Amino acid sequence: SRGEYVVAKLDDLVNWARRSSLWPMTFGLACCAVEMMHMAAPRYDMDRFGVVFRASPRQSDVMIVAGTLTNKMAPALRKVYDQMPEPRYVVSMGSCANGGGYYHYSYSVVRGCDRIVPVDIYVPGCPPTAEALLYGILQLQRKIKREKRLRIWYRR
Amino acid sequence: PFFDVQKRLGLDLDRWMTIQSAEQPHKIPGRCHAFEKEWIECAHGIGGIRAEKECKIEFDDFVECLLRQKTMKRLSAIKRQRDKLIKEGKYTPPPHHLGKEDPRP
Amino acid sequence: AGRIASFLKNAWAKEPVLVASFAIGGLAIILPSLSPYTNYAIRINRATPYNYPVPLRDDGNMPDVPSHPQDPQGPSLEWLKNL
Amino acid sequence: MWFEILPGIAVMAACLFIPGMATAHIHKFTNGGKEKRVAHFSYQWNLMERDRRISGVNRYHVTKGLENID
Amino acid sequence: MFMINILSLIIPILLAVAFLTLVERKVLGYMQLRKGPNVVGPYGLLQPIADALKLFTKEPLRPATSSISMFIIAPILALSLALTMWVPLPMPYPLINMNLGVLFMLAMSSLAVYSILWSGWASNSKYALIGALRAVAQTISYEVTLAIILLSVLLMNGSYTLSTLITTQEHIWMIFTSWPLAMMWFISTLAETNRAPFDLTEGESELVSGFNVEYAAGPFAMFFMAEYANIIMMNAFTAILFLGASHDPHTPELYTINFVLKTLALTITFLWIRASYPRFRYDQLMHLLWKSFLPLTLALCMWHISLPIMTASIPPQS
Amino acid sequence: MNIMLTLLTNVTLASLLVLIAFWLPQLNAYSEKTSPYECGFDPMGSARLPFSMKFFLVAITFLLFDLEIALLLPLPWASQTNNLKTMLTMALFLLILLAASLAYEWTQKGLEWAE
Amino acid sequence: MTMYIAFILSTIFVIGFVGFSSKPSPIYGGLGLIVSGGVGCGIVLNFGGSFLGLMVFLIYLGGMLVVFGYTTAMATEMYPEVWVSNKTVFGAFVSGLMMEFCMVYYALKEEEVEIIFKFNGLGDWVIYDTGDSGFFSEEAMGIAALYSYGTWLVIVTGWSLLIGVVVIMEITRGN
Amino acid sequence: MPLVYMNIIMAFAIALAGLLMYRSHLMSSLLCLEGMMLSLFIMSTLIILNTHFTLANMMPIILLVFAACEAALGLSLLVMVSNTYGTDYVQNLNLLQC
Amino acid sequence: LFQAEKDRRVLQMLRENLEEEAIIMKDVPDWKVGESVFHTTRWVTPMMGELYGLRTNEEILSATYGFIWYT
Numbered sequence A: 001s002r003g004e005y006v007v008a009k010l011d012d013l014v015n016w017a018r019r020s021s022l023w024p025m026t027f028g029l030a031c032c033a034v035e036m037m038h039m040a041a042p043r044y045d046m047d048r049f050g051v052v053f054r055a056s057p058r059q060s061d062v063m064i065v066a067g068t069l070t071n072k073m074a075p076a077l078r079k080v081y082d083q084m085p086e087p088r089y090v091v092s093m094g095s096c097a098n099g100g101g102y103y104h105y106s107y108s109v110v111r112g113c114d115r116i117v118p119v120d121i122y123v124p125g126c127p128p129t130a131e132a133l134l135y136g137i138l139q140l141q142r143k144i145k146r147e148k149r150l151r152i153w154y155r156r
Numbered sequence B: 001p002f003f004d005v006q007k008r009l010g011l012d013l014d015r016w017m018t019i020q021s022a023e024q025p026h027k028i029p030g031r032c033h034a035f036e037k038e039w040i041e042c043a044h045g046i047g048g049i050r051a052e053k054e055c056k057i058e059f060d061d062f063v064e065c066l067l068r069q070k071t072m073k074r075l076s077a078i079k080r081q082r083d084k085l086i087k088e089g090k091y092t093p094p095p096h097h098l099g100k101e102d103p104r105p
Numbered sequence C: 001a002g003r004i005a006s007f008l009k010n011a012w013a014k015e016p017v018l019v020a021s022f023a024i025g026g027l028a029i030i031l032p033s034l035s036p037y038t039n040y041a042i043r044i045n046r047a048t049p050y051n052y053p054v055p056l057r058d059d060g061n062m063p064d065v066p067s068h069p070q071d072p073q074g075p076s077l078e079w080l081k082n083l
Numbered sequence D: 001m002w003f004e005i006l007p008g009i010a011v012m013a014a015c016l017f018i019p020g021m022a023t024a025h026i027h028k029f030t031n032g033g034k035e036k037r038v039a040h041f042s043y044q045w046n047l048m049e050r051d052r053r054i055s056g057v058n059r060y061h062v063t064k065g066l067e068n069i070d
Numbered sequence E: 001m002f003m004i005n006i007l008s009l010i011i012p013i014l015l016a017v018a019f020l021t022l023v024e025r026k027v028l029g030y031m032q033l034r035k036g037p038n039v040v041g042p043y044g045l046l047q048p049i050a051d052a053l054k055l056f057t058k059e060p061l062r063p064a065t066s067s068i069s070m071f072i073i074a075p076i077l078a079l080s081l082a083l084t085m086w087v088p089l090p091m092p093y094p095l096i097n098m099n100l101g102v103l104f105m106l107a108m109s110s111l112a113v114y115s116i117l118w119s120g121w122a123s124n125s126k127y128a129l130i131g132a133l134r135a136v137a138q139t140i141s142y143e144v145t146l147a148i149i150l151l152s153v154l155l156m157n158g159s160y161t162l163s164t165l166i167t168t169q170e171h172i173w174m175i176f177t178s179w180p181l182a183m184m185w186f187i188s189t190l191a192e193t194n195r196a197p198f199d200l201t202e203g204e205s206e207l208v209s210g211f212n213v214e215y216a217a218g219p220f221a222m223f224f225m226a227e228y229a230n231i232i233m234m235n236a237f238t239a240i241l242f243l244g245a246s247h248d249p250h251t252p253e254l255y256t257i258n259f260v261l262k263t264l265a266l267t268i269t270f271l272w273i274r275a276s277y278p279r280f281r282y283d284q285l286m287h288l289l290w291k292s293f294l295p296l297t298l299a300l301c302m303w304h305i306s307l308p309i310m311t312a313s314i315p316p317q318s
Numbered sequence F: 001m002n003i004m005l006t007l008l009t010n011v012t013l014a015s016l017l018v019l020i021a022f023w024l025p026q027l028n029a030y031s032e033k034t035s036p037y038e039c040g041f042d043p044m045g046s047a048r049l050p051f052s053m054k055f056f057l058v059a060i061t062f063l064l065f066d067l068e069i070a071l072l073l074p075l076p077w078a079s080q081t082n083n084l085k086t087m088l089t090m091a092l093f094l095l096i097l098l099a100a101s102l103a104y105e106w107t108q109k110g111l112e113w114a115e
Numbered sequence G: 001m002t003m004y005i006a007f008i009l010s011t012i013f014v015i016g017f018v019g020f021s022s023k024p025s026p027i028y029g030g031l032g033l034i035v036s037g038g039v040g041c042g043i044v045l046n047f048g049g050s051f052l053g054l055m056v057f058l059i060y061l062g063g064m065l066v067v068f069g070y071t072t073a074m075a076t077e078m079y080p081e082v083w084v085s086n087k088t089v090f091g092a093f094v095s096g097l098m099m100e101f102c103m104v105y106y107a108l109k110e111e112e113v114e115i116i117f118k119f120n121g122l123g124d125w126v127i128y129d130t131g132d133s134g135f136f137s138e139e140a141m142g143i144a145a146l147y148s149y150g151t152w153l154v155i156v157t158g159w160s161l162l163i164g165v166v167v168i169m170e171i172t173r174g175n
Numbered sequence H: 001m002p003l004v005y006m007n008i009i010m011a012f013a014i015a016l017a018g019l020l021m022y023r024s025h026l027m028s029s030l031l032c033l034e035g036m037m038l039s040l041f042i043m044s045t046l047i048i049l050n051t052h053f054t055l056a057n058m059m060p061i062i063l064l065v066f067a068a069c070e071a072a073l074g075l076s077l078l079v080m081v082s083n084t085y086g087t088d089y090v091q092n093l094n095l096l097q098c
Numbered sequence I: 001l002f003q004a005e006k007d008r009r010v011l012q013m014l015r016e017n018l019e020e021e022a023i024i025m026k027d028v029p030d031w032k033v034g035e036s037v038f039h040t041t042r043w044v045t046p047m048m049g050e051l052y053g054l055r056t057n058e059e060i061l062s063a064t065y066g067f068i069w070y071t
């Protein structure tokens, strides 16, 4: 069918643009943020993949939870997640964000940020190296490549 | 009230700008230089009361130059009659009033 | 003689921008009144014929007025080409 | 690399070339190829309108030389 | 056929802005010992296209507490004015030939600030308001000095016509006559375009996003395009003003190439400056413009009024 | 006429870009998403509250100084007059009084922002 | 009647005046005055006054920027008013629009006398000059003659501006 | 008089009316003062251009200058009033009676 | 030369308008054809409503706004 071919090509084009231009929110919680900085530094240079930090949630596509999420902080993380225009993605980075980690049995720690927001990629480590975070980012790009919103819409 | 220090000292603080017939830059004339010159000359030195009655012809011509009210009335009376004459159809305006003229240098 | 020198030294050490601006403004005020070329500029501004030179009616006793543009009478612009 | 910056600068330079060259070519094309006349003052506009009147085709650019003097 | 000219001016400007962004990222990266975009396309040549396609397919957000009419009008005004400032520039022939082209650019640049003002106010958020008020202070700082500098420089031209500037600099660049004015003009253009070290309105480290913090998707993209088109436009204006290329009426493309090269050099200097200096404080910007630039500018204005009369150097035009 | 066409074209292009930006993508607007942004926590007061101007006197002064550029802008044409001595005296007179205005405001602490 | 450009521009001028004369939030009022300034610049351009129109537009852009800055500080009014936010403001705006349209209609097809004199329309193109000469702009020469003829005007204007600086500094001193 | 002159005069009348009918904000009235100045500028420029009075071409510029002095004056007063009340409402200026 | 041709052009347009006025207002009650509006008998420069009054809107627009709109 011609229509199916057209929606497939438009799907690929949109998927390509989104993966290519991923803007994470300038947002860091704890130790893991330091490795995030090392991903932006010369050695790795995330900017060369089209990945640039932007402070505003309105101009951001990706949230990287890089650090422990405490109970006091969870409403603010949820709020800045909700202020991201869609499509939006969340990368959970480090043991603390993934499941609580070293502070899993604390009265003031959220046992995993996926209780608060939906997570796309879980990056293990304490902290994950800058290379491991880069691997997770490229995995998120690969996942975005697989999405077929237009094909799904056409089939409806 | 009016203390005429400009006349007393011959200083000319603001009289250069009172009328449009008074020494413009590059001798550029006003639109009504002749009319205002004639009106000013006619009324010079006879006083305000006399000038209003005796120089009314010059002043009326000057005002007609300034606002052109009679000219617009005459043109409107011309074009209304032309519109009436064409609407019922016995005028047929000439080809040089429609764009078919042979222009001259 | 000695106070003004110390004041100038202090001003140059603390506010050189103000010293430079005051010097430039003072030169701009003073120098035009001491220049020989200031007259020439006026003459140049007088030689530019913005409007038409309306001819005069020859009354018969007008020697210095030319009868033709190329006649030797009248103003000359020879000083301008050599400038 | 530093010479890998050059391709982007070349693309930008090529893009910035287009407006001026396009304006020059369009001016030549619509003005008879003899440059667009400039009218900053009413005397130049009067010359242009006289040219349009005497051109016989309502175009200021068409020029009538000494072949109109019998 | 004039419409074709309008399009031939508009579309290439937008393409140059899109690639200017790629150039800034690459220049800043190499100045920071890294590479910058080099994956999305060869040498990152497709990165601007991906950025544009991403921004125009993302969700535009209208804030709940915002005023919609101004919120939507402001980016339109910004982009349309940025495109309008290009029409009187002679490269070497302008699209629109104006007697007072300099005054036209002055007035439209003055009107361009209201995009930032109305955007910040209509966002109805505190950071946007702080950015808008910083724009107010910035304009107050630079406007008087910029106008007086332009007047002082154009006392050598004889008019406000931009094409006459080509004739004025037929033998020498005007920067050899007025480099003290050129330095202050360059800094004032940095302030006027909201560029680092004078980029107070965005205030990224300080105010997160400044005036457009609440803008997303396409409207934000329009603000970004307007800003970069303004960078290019102001540098082209400076290149025409101070580094005048020689124009052959039978080969205008030589002038076009020379002018474009000079404009690129000045824009790259802008990007070079952004990677070298810390940000000003905005009251410090006001004090710099009012206590240093203003007195020197006044003095140099008097000097440039007196000098042509002193040396019989008054330019031709009425 | 050409400038009017240019302005219409630019405004039309910008408005079309806004319309595409608002009608092409998928919108999922909800109350949390449209709430004002203040770094993750809800704002305390209104953004429509009085925001003090500390440079208020410079702003008033800018009004007068801006009108002086209007007086100095016809200077290029004034240099073409025959009375260059009168013209130059007036041009310098206006710039000296402009500088004196700045000197008075500077010395009387008018250029300092309020604390 | 040709293209109705001048009449359209003057109508937009009046509409902007009605907008800021309604006395809504100053931010909105400032916008209406900016619209009026731009449109008045267009009107003056359509008559040969390029410099005067551009100068007035620039001056009012600067003044309205200062007014915006002052409004955010001293005229804020937590729920600011747009023309449709209040019955008084909307009523004044509608009254202004209706009164302008009524005057235009009464002066357009017929020829009424309102206060001073009458009008038939005819377009403003009728009253032009036909003068054909010049390598200069008459408006520019008239404005430039301020430095040779208007010596007294320059003196009084400069003194007034210096005194204005002194006066504003005296008024806001307080104590 | 053409329609443009009556439109300019109507603009002046609307602004004068706006000035006279006070609402609450003082700044709203200063804006009507500015509008009256703008209407006068346009009117006098149109008259001057039409009659080709070359010398008069400098008077609107002068007219602009004293427009700023009047605006800067008014804003200055608006500061002091606000500093007394935290509001620019004209209702607060009721200490003196007739 | 330009003045000599401009005089003839203006005079020819005025004469053509006069010849058309003689025809249009033949049967208007007391219309005096070619009557001036000024008391004085000296020459008055025409108003451009007197020259282009009976002509098409294209040349009227070009005569009024042609120079101003040319960019």
Ligand SMILES: CCCCCCCCCCCCCCCCC[C@@H](O)O[C@H](CO[C@H](O)CCCCCCCCCCCCCCC)COP(=O)(O)OCC[N+](C)(C)C
Pocket (backbone or CB within 6 Å): A009, A010, A012, A013, A016, E039, E046, E049
């Ligand atoms: C007049 C025009 C109007 C519309 C203009 C829109 C812009 C034009 C379209 C531009 C498209 C360019 C983008 C496509 C480039 C694809 C790049 C290519 O390399 O992607 C490959 C795959 O390509 C994509 O699957 C398809 C991309 C293109 C899809 C079809 C595009 C059709 C365009 C039609 C335009 C229609 C416009 C509709 C609106 C009018 C896989 O690469 P990737 O895996 O990432 O690489 C990872 C990094 N590695 C390699 C180093 C590891």
Ligand SMILES: CCCCCCCCCCCCCCCCC[C@@H](O)O[C@H](CO[C@H](O)CCCCCCCCCCCCCCC)COP(=O)(O)OCC[N+](C)(C)C
Pocket (backbone or CB within 6 Å): F016, F017, F019, F020, F023, F024, F025, F026, F027
């Ligand atoms: C680069 C600058 C120039 C660009 C040049 C092209 C200009 C493009 C135009 C700009 C708009 C872009 C929008 C593209 C998507 C279409 C959106 C809308 O127009 O379509 C629907 C319009 O349909 C409406 O439901 C109404 C349909 C019928 C009711 C009134 C229409 C009457 C017309 C009669 C049609 C019958 C056949 C006509 C044959 C000619 C609205 O659906 P809606 O969900 O809200 O909007 C979100 C769109 N999504 C889904 C893609 C995300």
Ligand SMILES: CCCCCCCCCCCCCCCCC[C@@H](O)O[C@H](CO[C@H](O)CCCCCCCCCCCCCCC)COP(=O)(O)OCC[N+](C)(C)C
Pocket (backbone or CB within 6 Å): B012, B013, B023, F083, F085, F086, F089, F090, F093, G148, G149, G151, G152, G155, G159
């Ligand atoms: C009798 C009063 C003396 C004591 C009281 C002082 C109060 C008055 C303030 C100053 C008085 C000066 C005003 C005099 C009128 C100026 C016009 C006249 O004098 O000629 C001008 C002479 O102007 C010269 O530049 C010299 C006078 C300028 C004086 C400098 C300004 C100082 C004023 C300071 C006091 C004002 C208030 C305080 C401000 C600091 C130009 O003439 P010119 O161009 O040949 O020919 C014009 C005719 N054309 C065009 C057809 C060819």
Ligand SMILES: CCCCCCCC/C=C\CCCCCCCC(=O)O[C@H](COC(=O)CCCCCCC/C=C/CCCCCCCC)COP(=O)(O)OCCN
Pocket (backbone or CB within 6 Å): C008, C011, C015, C018, C019, C020, C021, C022, C023, C024, C025, C026, C027, C029, E294, E295, E296, E298, E299, F096, F099, F100, F102, F103, F106, F107
């Ligand atoms: C003859 C022509 C005069 C006019 C031409 C000049 C044109 C415009 C130039 C002046 C513009 C206005 C100047 C404003 C004056 C400022 C006064 C002032 O406030 O000064 C103090 C500082 O004191 C000074 O005034 C600086 C020194 C005194 C003035 C500068 C020098 C005066 C003249 C010097 C040059 C004279 C000619 C050069 C001689 C060459 C040597 C042979 C300011 O510093 P603060 O803000 O308090 O610093 C706080 C942070 N630490």
Ligand SMILES: C=C(C)[C@H]1Cc2c(ccc3c2O[C@@H]2COc4cc(OC)c(OC)cc4[C@@H]2C3=O)O1
Pocket (backbone or CB within 6 Å): A026, A027, A028, A029, A030, A033, A034, A036, A037, A040, A053
């Ligand atoms: C923007 C670039 C090039 C780097 C710098 C940077 C990031 C990402 C995130 C942040 C950041 O710096 C800021 C400021 O300094 C710290 C210091 C921190 O601890 C050392 C910390 O931990 C949460 C967070 C921060 C900020 C932060 O979140 O990439």
Ligand code: SF4
Pocket (backbone or CB within 6 Å): A030, A031, A032, A033, A066, A067, A068, A093, A094, A095, A096, A097, A101, A102, A125, A126, A127, A128
């Ligand atoms: S996972 Fe480890 S490195 Fe990361 S924030 Fe938690 S404790 Fe620090």
